[PDB]
C-alpha cells in the first residue's frame, strides 16, 4: 500500500541535492514511509499542506523534529509556541503576534531600509565580496539583535545557536550529535539573555515580557518565549537573503526586471523563500490512527513533511524550478501554514525586502566569480559561501 524507501533526506548526499530525490518521493505516492528513520513521508504539495492545517490530528507538542517527546527527553525545555498545540499554543501565539505585529513594522522599517541601503553601499567599495558573510549574514546581525534589545557582548553565540537548534529537529546523525556536543555555552548566553534585566526598552524582548501584565502570559513564561525569538528568525532570514542573491546571480533577467521595478522586491524575496524554502522539513506526531491520501497511518507515529518539495510539486507550481519574481507566490509553505505559520513572517520579509530594494536600486549586476560552498544543516537549506562581484548601477 504504502511504498517503503531507503532515501536518507538527512544525509549529506541528499543535502548537496536534493531535488531529483525530492521527485522520487513525490512521484513514490502521496504518502511515503521512510525505512532509514521509521518515520512517513508527504512531499507533494496537496499532503503537506493538509498535514499542516490539521493540527489536532498532526500535533507539534510531542515535537516537531524526529525525536517523539513521549519516548524521550526534549533536548531543551519545549518551546511555548513551536513544540506547543492548542489551547496551549493559543495566548503565546498571541503575544508574539502583537509584538512582532503590522503596527510594529512601522517602528522598525526605516532603520532596516538604512542598514541595508549602507550594508549594500559599503560591499560596492569593496567590489568582490562574499554574499553569505558579508550581505546574507552581516545584514540580519547588523538589524536584528538591536531590535531585540541584546547587548553587544555575546552575539556570536547567536548563530551557533540557532544552527544547533536546526540540527537537533534532525534524527540523531553526526550533524546533530556534534551539534549537541558543543551547545552548552550557546545555551547559557541565550538563555541569560531572556531575563529582563538584560533586553533593552523598546526591543521585541522588552516587549514580550511587557506583556505579562495583560493575563496572556505570566512572567516566568516570558523568558522561553524571548528564546523563542533567539532560535528562530536569524539563520532562516540569513539563508533566504542568500537565496534571493544566489538566484539574482544565476537569473540575471530576473535582476534586471527587478532593476526595472524596485517594488518587486517583496515578491522577489518571497519567490526566492518558495525556490529555496530556508526551512525544509518539519515533523508533526500522530494524535490518532489518520486516513492520509489513502494511506493508513497509525496513532504516536513521525510524519515528515517536505515543505521544500511541496514548494516545488508540479501538481501545483507552473515551471517550479524557475525562479520568478512576478509568480503569484501565495499559497507556498516556506513559512508554514495554518495556526503555527511563522510569527516572525512580518519581520523576515521586511529585511527581504529592504535589502533587495537595496541592490535593485545601487547595482548593475551581480557575478559568481569564486567557488559556491554548501552549508549543511538537518532542517536548513542554505550556502556557506558565495563569492560575487557587484557592478555599481
Ligand atoms: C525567511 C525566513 C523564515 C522562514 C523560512 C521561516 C519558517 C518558518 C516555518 C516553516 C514555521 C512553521 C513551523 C511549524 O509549522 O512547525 C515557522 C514558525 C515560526 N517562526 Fe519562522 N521563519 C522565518 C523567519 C522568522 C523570523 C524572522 C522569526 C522571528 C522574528 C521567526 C519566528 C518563528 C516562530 C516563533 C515560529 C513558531 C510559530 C508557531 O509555532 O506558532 N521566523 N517559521
Ligand atoms: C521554525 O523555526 C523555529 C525554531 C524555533 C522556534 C522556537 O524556539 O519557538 C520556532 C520556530
Ligand atoms: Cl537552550
Keep these: 500500500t504504502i511504498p517503503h524507501l531507503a532515501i536518507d533526506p538527512f544525509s549529506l548526499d541528499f543535502f548537496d541535492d536534493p531535488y531529483p530525490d525530492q521527485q522520487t518521493l513525490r512521484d513514490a505516492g502521496p504518502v511515503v514511509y521512510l525505512d532509514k528513520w521509521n518515520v512517513y513521508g508527504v512531499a507533494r504539495y496537496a499532503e503537506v499542506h493538509a498535514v499542516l492545517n490539521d493540527p489536532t490530528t498532526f500535533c507539534s507538542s510531542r515535537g516537531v523534529g524526529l525525536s517523539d517527546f513521549k519516548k524521550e527527553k526534549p533536548w531543551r525545555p519545549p518551546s511555548l509556541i513551536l513544540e506547543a498545540d492548542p489551547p496551549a499554543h493559543t495566548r503565546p501565539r498571541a503575544v508574539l503576534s502583537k509584538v512582532l505585529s503590522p503596527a510594529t513594522m512601522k517602528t522598525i522599517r526605516d532603520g532596516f531600509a538604512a542598514a541595508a541601503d549602507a550594508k549594500v553601499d559599503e560591499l560596492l567599495q569593496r567590489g568582490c565580496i562574499d554574499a553569505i558573510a558579508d550581505l546574507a549574514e552581516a545584514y540580519p546581525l547588523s538589524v536584528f539583535p538591536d531590535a531585540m534589545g541584546l547587548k553587544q557582548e555575546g552575539r ?3 548563530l551557533p545557536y540557532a544552527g544547533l537548534v536546526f540540527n537537533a529537529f534532525g534524527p540523531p546523525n553526526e550533524l546533530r550529535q556534534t551539534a549537541i556536543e558543543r551547545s552548552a555555552p550557546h545555551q547559557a548566553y541565550v538563555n541569560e539573555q531572556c531575563q529582563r534585566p538584560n533586553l533593552a526598552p523598546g526591543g521585541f524582548g522588552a516587549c514580550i515580557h511587557a506583556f505579562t501584565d495583560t493575563g496572556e502570559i505570566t512572567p516566568d513564561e516570558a523568558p522561553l518565549l524571548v528564546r523563542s525569538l533567539l532560535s528562530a528568525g536569524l539563520d532562516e532570514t540569513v539563508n533566504g537573503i542568500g537565496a534571493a542573491v ?16 524596485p517594488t518587486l522586491a517583496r515578491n522577489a524575496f518571497e519567490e526566492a523563500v518558495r525556490f529555496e524554502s530556508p526551512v525544509q522539513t518539519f515533523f508533526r506526531t500522530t494524535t490518532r490512527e489518520v486516513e492520509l491520501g489513502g494511506a493508513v497511518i497509525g496513532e504516536g507515529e513521525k510524519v515528515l513533511m517536505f515543505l521544500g518539495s511541496a514548494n516545488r510539486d508540479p501538481r501545483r507550481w507552473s515551471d517550479p524550478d524557475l525562479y520568478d519574481i512576478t509568480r503569484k507566490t501565495s499559497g507556498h509553505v516556506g ?3 495554518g495556526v503555527h505559520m511563522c510569527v516572525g513572517q512580518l519581520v523576515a520579509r521586511l529585511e527581504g525586502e529592504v535589502m533587495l530594494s537595496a ?3 545601487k547595482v548593475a549586476a551581480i557575478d559568481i566569480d569564486g567557488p559556491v560552498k554548501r552549508r549543511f544543516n538537518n532542517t536548513l537549506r542554505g550556502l556557506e559561501s558565495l563569492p560575487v562581484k557587484l557592478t555599481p548601477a
Design 156 to 158: 556570536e553565540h547567536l
Design 246 to 261: 544566489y538566484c539574482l546571480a544565476r537569473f540575471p533577467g530576473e535582476l534586471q526586471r527587478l532593476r526595472s521595478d
Design 335 to 337: 513559512f508554514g501554514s
Design 359 to 361: 541592490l535593485a536600486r
